[PDB]
Amino acid sequence: SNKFLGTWKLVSSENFDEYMKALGVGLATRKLGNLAKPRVIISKKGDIITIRTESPFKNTEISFKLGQEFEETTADNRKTKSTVTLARGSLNQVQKWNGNETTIKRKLVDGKMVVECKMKDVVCTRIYEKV
Ligand SMILES: CCCCCCCC/C=C\CCCCCCCC(=O)O
Known part of the structure; x- marks a missing residue:
């Protein structure tokens, strides 16, 4: 959709150390992981949506079509087989690798974006503010 479109800045994070931990990330990447206030920039051009995560430490861009696999x-x-769906206001995301699987849900709450990350027995909640 749109409500997603724009620039968001990390505001609050919870249980991210264990989300990473549970992903298999090692100490190094984690100290950095924890210490960052990423900026996300969701943008739409045609039917291709872009999600860009910027931080001093690392960048990340993804271009998808809802429904289609990428x-x-x-x-x-990690090298993942992801799918992005729209279900009742939230942008659910599915990442599959080997036989593992993780989910990322992006819902809109009081002009805030609530990122919910689940990885088998683990949930982390990261809150983001617009602009
Ligand atoms: C939040 C990504 C930038 C962090 C840089 C440090 C390296 C990250 C290590 C594991 C990252 C796991 C993927 C994070 C998903 C969060 C997505 C989001 O917050 O919009």
Whole structure:
């Protein structure tokens, strides 16, 4: 949709250390992971949507079509088979690799974006503010 379109800045994070931990990320990447206030820039050109995560430490851009499947390289070097769906105001995301699987849900709450990350027995909640 749109409500997503714009520039968002990280404001609050919760249980991210364990989300990473649970992803298999090692100490190094984690100290950095924890210490960052990323900026996300969702943009739409035609039917291709872009999600861009910027931080001093690392960048990440992804271009998808809702419904269609795509190959995404994570910020942690993983090579994933992701799908992005629109279900009742939230942009759910599915990442599959090997036999593992993680989900990222982006919902709009009081002009805030609430990012919910689940990885088997683990949820982390990162809040973002617009602009
Ligand atoms: C939040 C990505 C930028 C962090 C840089 C440090 C390297 C990240 C290590 C593991 C990242 C796991 C993927 C994070 C998903 C969060 C998505 C979002 O917050 O919009």
